[PDB]
Amino acid sequence: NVAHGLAWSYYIGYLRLILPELQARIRTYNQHGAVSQRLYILLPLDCGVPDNLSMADPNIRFLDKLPQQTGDRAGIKDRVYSNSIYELLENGQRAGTCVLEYATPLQTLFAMSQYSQAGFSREDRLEQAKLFCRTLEDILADAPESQNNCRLIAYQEPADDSSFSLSQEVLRHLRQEE
Amino acid sequence: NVAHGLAWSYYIGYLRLILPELQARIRTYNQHGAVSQRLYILLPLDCGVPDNLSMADPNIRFLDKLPQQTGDRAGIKDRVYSNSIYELLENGQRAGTCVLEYATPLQTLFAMSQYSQAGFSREDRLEQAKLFCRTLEDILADAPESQNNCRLIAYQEPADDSSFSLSQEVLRHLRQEE
Numbered sequence: 001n002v003a004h005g006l007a008w009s010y011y012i013g014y015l016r017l018i019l020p021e022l023q024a025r026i027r028t029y030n031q032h033g034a035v036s037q038r039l040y041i042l043l044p045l046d047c048g049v050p051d052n053l054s055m056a057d058p059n060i061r062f063l064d065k066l067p068q069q070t071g072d073r074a075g076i077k078d079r080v081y082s083n084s085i086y087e088l089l090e091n092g093q094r095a096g097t098c099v100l101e102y103a104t105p106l107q108t109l110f111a112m113s114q115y116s117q118a119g120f121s122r123e124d125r126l127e128q129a130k131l132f133c134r135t136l137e138d139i140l141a142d143a144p145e146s147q148n149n150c151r152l153i154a155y156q157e158p159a160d161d162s163s164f165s166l167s168q169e170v171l172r173h174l175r176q177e178e
Numbered sequence: 179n180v181a182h183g184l185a186w187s188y189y190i191g192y193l194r195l196i197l198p199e200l201q202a203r204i205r206t207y208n209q210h211g212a213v214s215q216r217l218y219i220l221l222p223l224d225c226g227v228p229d230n231l232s233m234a235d236p237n238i239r240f241l242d243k244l245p246q247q248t249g250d251r252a253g254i255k256d257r258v259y260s261n262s263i264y265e266l267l268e269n270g271q272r273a274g275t276c277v278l279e280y281a282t283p284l285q286t287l288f289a290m291s292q293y294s295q296a297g298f299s300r301e302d303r304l305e306q307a308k309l310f311c312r313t314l315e316d317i318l319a320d321a322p323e324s325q326n327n328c329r330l331i332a333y334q335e336p337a338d339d340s341s342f343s344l345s346q347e348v349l350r351h352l353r354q355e356e
């Protein structure tokens with residue numbers, strides 16, 4: 001159960017750091033469409049994690065970066081936490097604007113299964129992905145740092161069985177927020 | 179064995195990314211004392227990881243940041259990888275200059291043991307710290323990205339049994355490099 005530790009490191013080393021500061025950074029961007037107040041985290045269960053969101057879906061279009069957040073951690077001065085703002089397109093219309101990113105450790109899990117000395121079977125990718133999501137979900141429920149600042153989006157593509165829309169999937173979560 | 183996954187994520191998500199670019203970034207700083215060509219990674223086995231190196235030892239003094247490295251990862255545009263350059267003091271003399279940082283996942287392990295729903299006993303901190311170091315050591319030996327760019331510094335303090343010098347410990351590894 002490698003995913004257990006990854007989910008926890010994901011919270012301890014990232015989410016619990018940037019969530020308390022998130023709304024303030026969003027507010028500043030709006031003043032200096034309007035960006036939503038939640039961090040939208042993509043959790044593909046096939047552990048496919050492209051580095052370019054626009055490559056996953058054309059209807060997901062990069063707009064701008066948030067103001068950076070800096071902190072000193074583990075000897076590194078001014079470690080930089082950045083987040084990208086995306087516009088969600090529907091039939092050529094902008095249907096939403098939000099801070100959007102994949103959950104990186106899912107990309108780490110995928111990479112792990114490719115390394116022989118990592119002792120992690122490629123067959124277990126879906127299982128660890130599910131555990132990661134569940135663990136993360138349990139954490140953020142109890143997480144004091146998370147108060148209406150964060151939304152987990154987890155999904156299973158047909159994987160060439162059918163056609164899938166990542167933009168529509170995010171828009172779904174975004175419209176319920178409304 | 180949570181440390182196994184953390185060590186691997188440490189390599190996959192950090193070291194294998196920044197090590198190929200490290201020497202070039204060091205070279206640029208020297209031209210634009212002289213900084214060593216290796217990344218020196220502190221691995222305290224008690225999993226104590228202060229965020230301020232100068233608080234660990236006064237003889238470890240922050241000098242400057244390296245040139246930043248940027249890349250797009252998992253939907254985040256221009257994710258920033260930064261590193262701090264430190265001067266090592268000995269009897270008021272500068273005995274060395276190098277890129278120096280703790281290994282962050284050791285701080286994550288420590289934090290994990292404090293969380294009840296993380297299911298990680300505080301007694302196991304030393305054990306996981308050892309596994310983390312060993313796993314990381316095995317990886318970097320086989321790691322193609324690591325060619326004379328990286329040095330692991332692992333240690334056990336007396337923990338108030340005696341007085342310990344972190345600067346002298348780093349200087350030891352640094353002088354063998356010479």
Ligand SMILES: Nc1ncnc2c1ncn2[C@@H]1O[C@@H]2/C=C/P(=O)(O)O[C@H]3[C@@H](F)[C@H](n4cnc5c(N)ncnc54)O[C@@H]3COP(=O)(O)O[C@H]2[C@H]1F
Pocket residue numbers: 009010012013014076079080081082103104105106108187188189191192193254257258259260281282283286
């Ligand atoms: N710039 C860096 N400067 C120093 N060290 C780094 C950096 N990069 C990786 N490292 C080391 O490599 C480990 C990474 C395993 P991962 O698979 O990438 O998942 C990580 C990651 F998804 C998420 N996260 C953390 N910061 C950010 C960020 N700025 N933007 C987006 N996501 C972030 O938190 C997980 C673990 O967080 P940690 O800090 O505790 O551990 C890290 C750490 F040891």
